[PDB]
């Protein structure tokens, strides 16, 4: 079902098997590096990412010491890191916003299996875009991911309301309930959760 779908929940406790397989996973985790609900490093290592894909791509936002930890989770979950996108943070005049001031944010790109029929090479590993709210990723990532893998099933982890997109199923704890339209998903959800509760 092409239009947006989402599930308010805690990815720690949700049974992600009901969700099926996806061509692209994206996550922007709340690394313990706390102004919001943080996850520990073991909690991040234990996330059941491996069931989510058989052949596809993982897009994993990182920062600070998560740059290394995120590489660990990526490998633990069974992916190879094959690219790394950086988003250059500009203002409206297209000028750039520990030891150095950080003009950029990193997003690791992992691959798993033998994904085929993708359009590798269309975009380049730099995003230039204006900062919206704090902690918001740039919308360009979705256009990049759609050109890479058009029309396919995609899941986002640790999303918020604005993150909901067509072809995407968003998982987040600050979301407005459960909104599912794919029949195969709606089925396995009712089977696993008859009274809607995790």
């Amino acid at each position: 079902l092409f239009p947006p779908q989402w599930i308010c929940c805690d990815i720690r406790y949700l049974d992600v098997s009901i969700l099926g397989k996806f061509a692209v996973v994206m996550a922007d985790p709340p690394w313990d590096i706390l102004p919001y609900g943080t996850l520990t490093d073991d909690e991040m290592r234990r996330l059941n990412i491996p069931v989510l894909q058989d052949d596809g791509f993982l897009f994993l936002w990182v920062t600070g010491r998560a740059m290394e930890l995120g590489r660990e989770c990526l490998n633990l979950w069974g992916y190879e890191r094959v690219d790394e996108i950086i988003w250059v943070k500009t203002n409206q005049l297209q000028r750039i916003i520990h030891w150095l001031n950080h003009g950029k944010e990193h997003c690791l790109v992992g691959v798993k299996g033998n994904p085929q029929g993708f359009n590798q090479g269309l975009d380049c590993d730099v995003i230039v875009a204006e900062v919206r709210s704090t902690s918001h990723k740039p919308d360009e990532i979705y256009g990049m991911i759609e050109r890479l893998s058009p029309g396919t099933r995609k899941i986002e982890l640790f999303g918020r309301p604005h993150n909901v997109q067509p072809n995407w199923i968003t998982l987040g704890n600050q979301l407005d309930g459960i909104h599912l339209l794919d029949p195969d998903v709606v089925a396995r959800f009712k089977q696993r959760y008859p009274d809607g509760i995790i």
């Binding site: 190879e80 380049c124 360009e140």
Partner: protein, 244 residues
């Protein structure tokens, strides 16, 4: 959406960044404090690194990656990992390691840990293609996107600038890294013993000891080099006046 614009016209999004307090004293102070440039031809694979004394405050390491010769001796990360960097680093010191944009972003982190550093900064050289929008990039097999940048990783061991360098992409088979990396390092004021491994004649520079295989001349002398840091000069940051 400059990403769609790149998919339309071939201009990398970084082409459109504009513009890419007088810290002039710092720079002058750096330049007053710089040791004379020293340099040594040395075939590093076959060269025992320990001969390089004293222990260095900063190490800049620029090994020739195969990927640097897209259309053109390359060092593998296998080779690089075996360099005995920890033996010539000072107990408190910094490393700046150019990692390319491929497996080096991972293997370079293994090296940093192997030699005893923790990464505190990831500096990106973003290459604009303003003078050749119509030149497509022959990608690495594992690549998912066109790769338009290179990473320089900053390591620390022991107790003004952004983390971005934007310049135009060098002509094919020019492997030079932006001189700006040197400004970013010197402005940190991390001390005066500064070694650049795999530099070339073109990278020699006041305040720096350069070692590489392609250097055409040497002037290096350990006792002479050490004299520049004997007391009362041993602990200078490189950002203060000369002791009278």
């Amino acid at each position: 959406d400059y990403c769609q614009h790149f998919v339309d016209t071939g201009h990398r999004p970084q082409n459109f960044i504009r513009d890419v307090e007088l810290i002039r004293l710092k720079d002058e102070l750096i330049a007053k404090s710089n040791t004379p440039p020293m340099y040594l031809q040395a075939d590093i694979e076959a060269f025992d690194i320990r001969e390089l004394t004293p222990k260095f405050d900063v190490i800049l390491l620029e090994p020739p990656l195969e990927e640097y010769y897209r259309e053109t001796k390359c060092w593998t990360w296998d080779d690089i990992m075996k360099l005995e960097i920890d033996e010539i680093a000072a107990p408190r010191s910094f490393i700046f390691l150019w990692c390319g944009s491929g497996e080096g972003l991972d293997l370079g982190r293994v090296c940093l840990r192997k030699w005893g550093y923790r990464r505190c900064e990831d500096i990106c050289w973003i290459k604009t293609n303003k003078n050749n929008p119509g030149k497509t990039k022959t990608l690495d097999p594992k690549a998912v996107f066109q790769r338009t940048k290179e990473h320089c990783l900053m390591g620390i061991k022991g107790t003004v600038d952004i983390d971005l360098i934007i310049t135009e992409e060098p002509e094919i088979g020019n492997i030079e890294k932006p001189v700006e990396i040197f400004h970013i390092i010197e402005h940190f004021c991390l001390g005066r013993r500064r070694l650049h491994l795999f530099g070339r004649d073109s990278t020699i520079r006041p305040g720096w000891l350069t070692v590489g295989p392609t250097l055409t001349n040497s002037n290096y002398n350990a006792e002479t080099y050490a004299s520049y840091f004997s007391a009362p000069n041993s602990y200078l940051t490189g950002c203060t006046e000369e002791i009278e």
